Symmetry: C3
Subunit: 145 residues, 3 copies
């Protein structure tokens, strides 16, 4: 019964170690049987959820004196615990086939068990370009299985 799909991808928090923020109202964005708080999908009904997130990614250059790669991730928060558990993580960049401005896309999807009160957040690590389209192309939702 419960499900949700969010878009928006406010990247204002990522710099200071915060998760992405998402629209829950406008357009295809919706909450049904789930809650939302400060970028987190809050679970109301306990059980197995198929969680998913897609992140549209951009880059202005692709060199590696050291290394440039992006880390897309779905994480679990348990309110009484300081730790954000890695649930579904992808390490990604088309820089593997590079020698330039680029596009890439990260999809994460998986069935995880969630409890009432637990939250799920999306973090994108080391992003260097946010196009006007990134917020709406990127999305993050789930549905109870």
């Amino acid at each position: 019964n419960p499900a949700a799909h969010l878009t928006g991808a406010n990247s204002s928090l990522t710099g200071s170690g915060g998760p992405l923020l998402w629209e829950t109202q406008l357009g295809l964005a919706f909450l049904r049987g789930l809650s939302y708080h400060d970028g987190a999908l809050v679970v109301t009904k306990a059980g197995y959820y198929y969680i998913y997130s897609k992140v549209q990614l951009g880059g202005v250059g692709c060199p590696l004196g050291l290394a440039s790669t992006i880390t897309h991730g779905l994480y679990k928060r348990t309110p009484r615990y300081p730790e954000e558990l890695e649930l579904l993580v992808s390490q990604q960049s088309p820089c593997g086939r590079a020698t330039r401005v680029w596009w890439d896309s990260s999809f994460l999807g998986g069935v995880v068990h969630l409890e009432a009160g637990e939250e799920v957040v999306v973090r994108v690590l080391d992003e260097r370009l946010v196009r006007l389209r990134d917020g709406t192309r990127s999305y993050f939702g789930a549905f109870m299985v």
Copy 2:
């Protein structure tokens, strides 16, 4: 009971055409019409599509992109809104000419769909899309 569908195969044309009956292609509670998935029952659907891309070019490197998306056609406004969209750099100058490259774009998400509404899969420069295997390129959905 629950409506579900998985469309194998592929062909070129805007929208992409799909197989419906042959092989892993199936329709249960869902309809299909000329590159478009048609809904019978209203409700929330996890729709998905994977597109296999391949070529022997890519002069423009990572600047050469591929847009792959799911689009909903509605009568509330006779237009298509892009729902789930993926734009990727499928290759770069790292692959020489006369050398094959591959890439794959997956999309999946939950949208609300009324009865009679249609969803198509569209890809920028379908000249690169590789139809030949339906396991490599497919488009399906299922209600939540």
Copy 3:
């Protein structure tokens, strides 16, 4: 209760289909069985099956990676293709010092009878990074 399963990446001991964790942490089997890398269908029906694999390397071999979900009936030897993707995460002319990472996700609805198996196979699994069960996993659920 709706059958579901999520298997996490474990050290695969080139060696055939990938092996998975089924109990520890994010790994679980509910209504679904497991046997030597294969998810086993106990209750016939339609399943959304999914698999993600994390790929990474230094420089580049050759290099095209094939990531695929396959089906097999324990009576018959052949494994039928279900969901396959081909990627070229690196080029033969990329910097030999370039450390690259690319993820491959596959998801799709398939019909499965009772007793049938679903496996994940990757061409050059040496390029698969199974350090994290969060980076490489394989799950499914009945629709």
